[PDB]
């Protein structure tokens, strides 16, 4: 049939080939010099056994609805129903919950979904429900849950998703680059809008500068990252810090900087507040313990003199701090993010090209010069009319909670917690809807999630693959992939390089529907179809989005062609006039005219506002707090001696494309997710490559396939997140996961009272070669379909 069909995804733009109605090969877009291997999984993603073929309802839920046996969730026994029957039940449940409980019982949830301006699954969900009634909202996300709360308070920006100093300037000016828990090479494969991958050009240049010894790269990381491996182990200075001891390391660098007069007094005095209130802590005047190189050597396992050497090197020349997000996705994650800023402040290079800090470097091609282009605005969740049932009665519970507290809300309703200076009362949720997110991938401590779901009346999942979420649902609705629809997207993110047409590759498979059509038909049930669609279909909406784009471009001085011209004749437009950027430079150059958005206008090393909250676990300046569990001598490490990283996958985006055999064949071990193990740790357990091992703690147990790797320091392991949950006894708490989802082993706790964010990477485990029976993996084969024989 058809060859060279242009479209896009989180993993990049493709030229798709179709043969006899099947998507068979995905070639890289011709402008993409650095495509991701993951595009090879996209045909499988469209055509594999886990694709949701039709609406499905959990046997006993179909029988008894909200009066059903919730214990059977997870058993994977579902009945096919018609679309109209499914949508009716959906509507009737919305009606029932609104009448019985009101808006405090209802939660929606969304996530990374797919690229595409119109086919915005989160927007479809939010709009449809918002046209029916009120619900519990959430604040924050799992990416930068801690950082995005603390950083506004201390540097007046969210920071984490923002543009970074242009790489050309970094490469011409920085002499030391500090990668602090950041894997650029691995994580720039997938971006929010279709990636252009042009940032990899800069990484190649960096590689050459490293080889020539012009730039020294320091990696502060328990593991040799993909980036480190790429730049070269012979060249990269590796600080293999003990997991979760980064704050001690930060404080000791700060101490050294002060102790040896390497700090910038002028910068601290003129661009910051509160340094004087922090120093007594740092120096041990108010506790007897200097937060010094000697002190930190005990915690971090880094030689004190190496700590001092690091500080001195950072101060000695132009130094770029590149901070990732993983180190704030753990207990008290705000502390580490805050100390990145403090350390950068003490160095005094903030606002210089290739100096200072940033958190956005691994995301959205950050550091690529931004072009003078157009950014389209997609289908919004926003409504202009009130809900049909506009009940404001949340019965004395809060109407917004932190995103990661939703299970705590189900299990501990009425619990009162602090959140970033406010008081929150967790509502008794009864009905959850998921569209474009996978909770059994995303959230922590799956056995507790199981217990939480068992208190729910109704669970609805809408997806294009039969995920672990779908396995634990009551109603499952088949959404399409983006490859079965038409759309528009940005090409490039921070670069704003271009815009691409997403042309339909194949027709909707089976009776899968675009989320637009799902929620449109739902809205018809309560007479709000028109308010949802705004009188437009797919191609109408795409034309509307483009035209708004055309209007934005005129008056910004960028000319776009007409829609039909673009769609049918061009398919791709590219922008020009790339701009250099230096982050924080405006503030550095004129702090009076360009103040930070902080209480003082300055960098808050001490925050009176935070101090006044009276949170013992997030005080007025950064502090070392001991963790609920930590490796290398921390709590629990006598029982569970290994730190388990749940790092972002190299061969998927989260749980997406786990079902691809094309990709799995490249990294699976014994048919399972690989677990990475240090050679000394492996030899102590008699473990070797290919072994089926049990990774366990007091929270859960999983099976995985051992990879013995010297990239891992002793006492550090990894199972990449996104490995699907596959319980041996479906639905039972304490089931052994046969594929190896790390969130079976994580703990579900708030970072601190400030952010109340996910602490996913605060995880201790043991590993042993497994002595039980290895059953077949059942993760990727859909449900057990059930039929009425009567
Ligand atoms: N390929 C790919 N897959 C994805 O799933 C993906 N997801 C995207 C999203 S949504 C996000 S949030 C980002 C992920 O952003 P994030 O920064 O979380 O990335 P990771 O690669 O998981 O972790 C970065 C590094 O932290 C290190 N690290 C772990 N624990 C510690 C510790 O205690 N101390 C120190 N110093 N380092 C530590 C890890 O070893 C790793 O090299 O990537 C984005 N890009 C993505 N690309
Ligand atoms: N242990 C642990 N460590 C971690 O580092 C960690 N990181 C966290 C982070 S940073 C993030 S971003 C979250 C990610 O959590 P998130 O839930 O966002 O992850 P995905 O696996 O991308 O799930 C998206 C789902 O939407 C579906 N989908 C895609 N397109 C569509 C569409 O058009 N319509 C519909 N209806 N569905 C669609 C996909 O099939 C997929 O199942 O995981 C978090 N969880 C984490 N846990
Ligand atoms: Mo994220």
mmCIF file with all atom_site columns, N, CA and C in Angstrom, residues 370-376 490 495-499 549 552-553 556-558 560 574-577:
data_model
loop_
_atom_site.group_PDB
_atom_site.id
_atom_site.type_symbol
_atom_site.label_atom_id
_atom_site.label_alt_id
_atom_site.label_comp_id
_atom_site.label_asym_id
_atom_site.label_entity_id
_atom_site.label_seq_id
_atom_site.pdbx_PDB_ins_code
_atom_site.Cartn_x
_atom_site.Cartn_y
_atom_site.Cartn_z
_atom_site.occupancy
_atom_site.B_iso_or_equiv
_atom_site.pdbx_formal_charge
_atom_site.auth_seq_id
_atom_site.auth_comp_id
_atom_site.auth_asym_id
_atom_site.auth_atom_id
_atom_site.pdbx_PDB_model_num
ATOM 1  N N  . UNK A 1 370 ? 16.583 28.564 20.639 1.00 0.00 ? 370 UNK A N  1
ATOM 2  C CA . UNK A 1 370 ? 15.179 28.686 20.282 1.00 0.00 ? 370 UNK A CA 1
ATOM 3  C C  . UNK A 1 370 ? 14.973 29.584 19.062 1.00 0.00 ? 370 UNK A C  1
ATOM 4  N N  . UNK A 1 371 ? 14.242 29.067 18.068 1.00 0.00 ? 371 UNK A N  1
ATOM 5  C CA . UNK A 1 371 ? 13.975 29.813 16.847 1.00 0.00 ? 371 UNK A CA 1
ATOM 6  C C  . UNK A 1 371 ? 12.766 30.720 17.050 1.00 0.00 ? 371 UNK A C  1
ATOM 7  N N  . UNK A 1 372 ? 12.613 31.691 16.143 1.00 0.00 ? 372 UNK A N  1
ATOM 8  C CA . UNK A 1 372 ? 11.533 32.663 16.184 1.00 0.00 ? 372 UNK A CA 1
ATOM 9  C C  . UNK A 1 372 ? 10.362 32.088 15.394 1.00 0.00 ? 372 UNK A C  1
ATOM 10 N N  . UNK A 1 373 ? 9.603  31.196 16.042 1.00 0.00 ? 373 UNK A N  1
ATOM 11 C CA . UNK A 1 373 ? 8.582  30.416 15.369 1.00 0.00 ? 373 UNK A CA 1
ATOM 12 C C  . UNK A 1 373 ? 7.196  30.605 15.977 1.00 0.00 ? 373 UNK A C  1
ATOM 13 N N  . UNK A 1 374 ? 6.333  29.615 15.727 1.00 0.00 ? 374 UNK A N  1
ATOM 14 C CA . UNK A 1 374 ? 4.961  29.617 16.196 1.00 0.00 ? 374 UNK A CA 1
ATOM 15 C C  . UNK A 1 374 ? 4.767  28.374 17.060 1.00 0.00 ? 374 UNK A C  1
ATOM 16 N N  . UNK A 1 375 ? 4.059  28.541 18.188 1.00 0.00 ? 375 UNK A N  1
ATOM 17 C CA . UNK A 1 375 ? 3.635  27.424 19.018 1.00 0.00 ? 375 UNK A CA 1
ATOM 18 C C  . UNK A 1 375 ? 2.107  27.366 18.985 1.00 0.00 ? 375 UNK A C  1
ATOM 19 N N  . UNK A 1 376 ? 1.584  26.227 18.515 1.00 0.00 ? 376 UNK A N  1
ATOM 20 C CA . UNK A 1 376 ? 0.154  25.988 18.415 1.00 0.00 ? 376 UNK A CA 1
ATOM 21 C C  . UNK A 1 376 ? -0.412 25.752 19.809 1.00 0.00 ? 376 UNK A C  1
ATOM 22 N N  . UNK A 1 490 ? 4.123  20.335 17.325 1.00 0.00 ? 490 UNK A N  1
ATOM 23 C CA . UNK A 1 490 ? 5.398  21.019 17.236 1.00 0.00 ? 490 UNK A CA 1
ATOM 24 C C  . UNK A 1 490 ? 6.454  20.000 16.821 1.00 0.00 ? 490 UNK A C  1
ATOM 25 N N  . UNK A 1 495 ? 13.736 24.300 21.089 1.00 0.00 ? 495 UNK A N  1
ATOM 26 C CA . UNK A 1 495 ? 14.232 24.788 19.811 1.00 0.00 ? 495 UNK A CA 1
ATOM 27 C C  . UNK A 1 495 ? 13.179 25.506 18.970 1.00 0.00 ? 495 UNK A C  1
ATOM 28 N N  . UNK A 1 496 ? 11.904 25.166 19.208 1.00 0.00 ? 496 UNK A N  1
ATOM 29 C CA . UNK A 1 496 ? 10.801 25.582 18.352 1.00 0.00 ? 496 UNK A CA 1
ATOM 30 C C  . UNK A 1 496 ? 11.213 25.495 16.885 1.00 0.00 ? 496 UNK A C  1
ATOM 31 N N  . UNK A 1 497 ? 11.780 24.350 16.491 1.00 0.00 ? 497 UNK A N  1
ATOM 32 C CA . UNK A 1 497 ? 12.333 24.207 15.152 1.00 0.00 ? 497 UNK A CA 1
ATOM 33 C C  . UNK A 1 497 ? 11.287 24.257 14.035 1.00 0.00 ? 497 UNK A C  1
ATOM 34 N N  . UNK A 1 498 ? 10.166 23.558 14.221 1.00 0.00 ? 498 UNK A N  1
ATOM 35 C CA . UNK A 1 498 ? 9.151  23.477 13.185 1.00 0.00 ? 498 UNK A CA 1
ATOM 36 C C  . UNK A 1 498 ? 7.778  23.017 13.662 1.00 0.00 ? 498 UNK A C  1
ATOM 37 N N  . UNK A 1 499 ? 6.932  22.643 12.688 1.00 0.00 ? 499 UNK A N  1
ATOM 38 C CA . UNK A 1 499 ? 5.626  22.055 12.934 1.00 0.00 ? 499 UNK A CA 1
ATOM 39 C C  . UNK A 1 499 ? 5.439  20.948 11.901 1.00 0.00 ? 499 UNK A C  1
ATOM 40 N N  . UNK A 1 549 ? -2.669 29.527 14.994 1.00 0.00 ? 549 UNK A N  1
ATOM 41 C CA . UNK A 1 549 ? -1.241 29.565 14.726 1.00 0.00 ? 549 UNK A CA 1
ATOM 42 C C  . UNK A 1 549 ? -0.852 30.635 13.708 1.00 0.00 ? 549 UNK A C  1
ATOM 43 N N  . UNK A 1 552 ? -1.127 34.011 15.321 1.00 0.00 ? 552 UNK A N  1
ATOM 44 C CA . UNK A 1 552 ? -0.025 34.254 16.234 1.00 0.00 ? 552 UNK A CA 1
ATOM 45 C C  . UNK A 1 552 ? 1.219  34.666 15.456 1.00 0.00 ? 552 UNK A C  1
ATOM 46 N N  . UNK A 1 553 ? 1.475  33.966 14.343 1.00 0.00 ? 553 UNK A N  1
ATOM 47 C CA . UNK A 1 553 ? 2.649  34.210 13.524 1.00 0.00 ? 553 UNK A CA 1
ATOM 48 C C  . UNK A 1 553 ? 2.692  35.611 12.910 1.00 0.00 ? 553 UNK A C  1
ATOM 49 N N  . UNK A 1 556 ? 3.818  38.410 15.239 1.00 0.00 ? 556 UNK A N  1
ATOM 50 C CA . UNK A 1 556 ? 5.142  38.036 15.722 1.00 0.00 ? 556 UNK A CA 1
ATOM 51 C C  . UNK A 1 556 ? 6.149  38.101 14.573 1.00 0.00 ? 556 UNK A C  1
ATOM 52 N N  . UNK A 1 557 ? 5.632  38.242 13.341 1.00 0.00 ? 557 UNK A N  1
ATOM 53 C CA . UNK A 1 557 ? 6.451  38.400 12.149 1.00 0.00 ? 557 UNK A CA 1
ATOM 54 C C  . UNK A 1 557 ? 6.863  37.088 11.489 1.00 0.00 ? 557 UNK A C  1
ATOM 55 N N  . UNK A 1 558 ? 6.061  36.035 11.697 1.00 0.00 ? 558 UNK A N  1
ATOM 56 C CA . UNK A 1 558 ? 6.326  34.733 11.102 1.00 0.00 ? 558 UNK A CA 1
ATOM 57 C C  . UNK A 1 558 ? 5.140  34.361 10.217 1.00 0.00 ? 558 UNK A C  1
ATOM 58 N N  . UNK A 1 560 ? 3.004  31.741 8.090  1.00 0.00 ? 560 UNK A N  1
ATOM 59 C CA . UNK A 1 560 ? 2.636  30.351 7.881  1.00 0.00 ? 560 UNK A CA 1
ATOM 60 C C  . UNK A 1 560 ? 1.725  30.271 6.661  1.00 0.00 ? 560 UNK A C  1
ATOM 61 N N  . UNK A 1 574 ? 9.415  24.932 8.761  1.00 0.00 ? 574 UNK A N  1
ATOM 62 C CA . UNK A 1 574 ? 10.583 25.147 9.600  1.00 0.00 ? 574 UNK A CA 1
ATOM 63 C C  . UNK A 1 574 ? 10.787 26.641 9.835  1.00 0.00 ? 574 UNK A C  1
ATOM 64 N N  . UNK A 1 575 ? 11.193 26.979 11.062 1.00 0.00 ? 575 UNK A N  1
ATOM 65 C CA . UNK A 1 575 ? 11.380 28.359 11.465 1.00 0.00 ? 575 UNK A CA 1
ATOM 66 C C  . UNK A 1 575 ? 12.863 28.713 11.405 1.00 0.00 ? 575 UNK A C  1
ATOM 67 N N  . UNK A 1 576 ? 13.162 29.999 11.597 1.00 0.00 ? 576 UNK A N  1
ATOM 68 C CA . UNK A 1 576 ? 14.519 30.507 11.490 1.00 0.00 ? 576 UNK A CA 1
ATOM 69 C C  . UNK A 1 576 ? 14.797 31.481 12.629 1.00 0.00 ? 576 UNK A C  1
ATOM 70 N N  . UNK A 1 577 ? 15.966 32.136 12.552 1.00 0.00 ? 577 UNK A N  1
ATOM 71 C CA . UNK A 1 577 ? 16.423 33.113 13.528 1.00 0.00 ? 577 UNK A CA 1
ATOM 72 C C  . UNK A 1 577 ? 16.598 32.508 14.919 1.00 0.00 ? 577 UNK A C  1
#
